[PDB]
């Protein structure tokens, strides 16, 4: 009568999204940390169920199909960005952040996640713990980070690191206070990057199971194998690290699920 869903194995190791989204200190805007996430299962539904984010604009992907399709590797970049600059994260945007701090290609896959962080990253006075690049002689290349401590120069004469006229420090400090406006509030933004290569993927996502049905002619689906029969135990003790059995006429006669490791005769 009904349909039994696929009995994929137990929940394996989870991707470290807890420490990414709840770290006690985030990296600077110019010195943004680069982290690679792989060899786990990705679950974006649990983060979306709480819904603490005010930005969900994504191009090329959909939240419903995130659990179906998957890529080779996941890259995470976490750094504090105010909402004005946040609205500027789109690839079709220009400015100081989009051309001197971070760059996104036109064919970028994925999007970023931003949420309000007015409580954290602030004190009674102005917080000067975060800096950003302001002056550059050329457009920033996509997907790369440059950390230069040299004194930026604008005048014809060169200055040897002094703080004189026509040349100053390119980096500038932030001012985070609780009395600032909504648009000047400091938000915590994490970049979710997706890259697809010719190599097989290593992180896609987990899956659930259903209730057992016995002594009934109910169609099944075990590890992507479709068939009809009655699920009943037997005495066919088999060797481990196998998926399913067969017969002379290629018809499946036994399959084990990675939950109880039973016989589960097909017909």
């Amino acid at each position, epitope marked *: 009568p009904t349909e039994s869903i696929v009995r994929f194995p137990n929940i394996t190791n989870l991707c470290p999204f807890d420490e990414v989204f709840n770290a006690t200190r985030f990296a600077s805007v110019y010195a943004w940390n680069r982290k690679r996430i792989s060899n786990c299962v990705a679950d974006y539904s649990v983060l979306y169920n709480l819904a603490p984010f005010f930005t969900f604009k994504c191009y090329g992907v959909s939240p419903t199909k995130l659990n179906d399709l998957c890529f080779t590797n996941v890259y995470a970049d976490s750094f504090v960005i105010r909402g004005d600059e946040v609205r*500027q994260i789109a690839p079709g945007q220009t400015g100081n952040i989009a051309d001197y701090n971070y760059k996104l290609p036109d064919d970028f896959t994925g999007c970023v996640i931003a949420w309000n962080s007015n409580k954290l990253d602030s004190k009674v006075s102005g917080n000067y713990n975060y800096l950003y690049r302001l002056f550059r002689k050329s457009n920033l290349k996509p997907f790369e980070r440059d950390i230069s401590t040299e004194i930026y120069q*604008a005048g014809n004469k060169p200055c040897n690191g002094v703080a004189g006229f026509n040349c100053y420090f390119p980096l500038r400090s932030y001012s985070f206070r609780p*009395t600032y406006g909504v648009g000047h509030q400091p938000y915590r933004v994490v970049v979710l990057s997706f890259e697809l290569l010719h190599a097989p993927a290593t992180v896609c996502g987990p899956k659930k199971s259903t209730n057992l049905v016995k002594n009934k002619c109910v169609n099944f689906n075990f590890n992507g194998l479709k068939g009809t029969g009655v699920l009943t135990e037997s005495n066919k003790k088999f060797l481990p690290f196998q998926q399913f059995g067969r017969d002379i006429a290629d018809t499946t006669d036994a399959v084990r699920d990675p939950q109880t490791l039973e016989i589960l005769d097909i017909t």
Partner: antibody
Amino acid sequence: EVQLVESGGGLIQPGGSLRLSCAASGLTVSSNYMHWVRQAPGKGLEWVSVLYAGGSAFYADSVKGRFTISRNNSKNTLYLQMNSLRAEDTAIYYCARGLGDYLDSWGQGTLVTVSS
Amino acid sequence: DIQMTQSPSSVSASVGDRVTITCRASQGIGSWLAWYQQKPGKAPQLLIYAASTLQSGVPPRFSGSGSGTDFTLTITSLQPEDFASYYCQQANSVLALTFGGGTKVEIKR
């Protein structure tokens, strides 16, 4: 040691075009932020355009269209492109250089008038 | 988006007085304000930046302070040459400059 020379202003028809030149002596137009200001008579200042150190151009809400900036490194002079004018577009302007959120350099002023 | 208004319009004071020029902010912007002075028929000049620091060429008679929403331009000593309009300037994240009204300072006659 900083000086800015302005030229090209004058009386032109509203349905015409004008050439704006902003010359920098001790400054390079392709290495720092560029600022443009406007001031109609009888009132205060206003902002029309800002040119970045790269290929980024921004304009105000009233002037999103009909305005284009283009810098050249041949003679370190800035050129402004204009095709359309309004009745209130006549004002005084001072092309200038400055850092973020504040500017210190300033230039001279050439009057422009539009009438039929 | 952002609109800036100046409460004083025309204040009359002598040499031994404080102009008490203030700029009203609708939103919360602190320590990111600059004041500019222009003469009639002359180019404007910068006076202070970030509402706390003082320029090297500007004499230290000009003073300014403001935490989150209100700023002041109190001057220790007023000179006959230093009689001009003052404007409060606030920038945006895309370096969108905004200029409001001006206040002219004169002497009670």
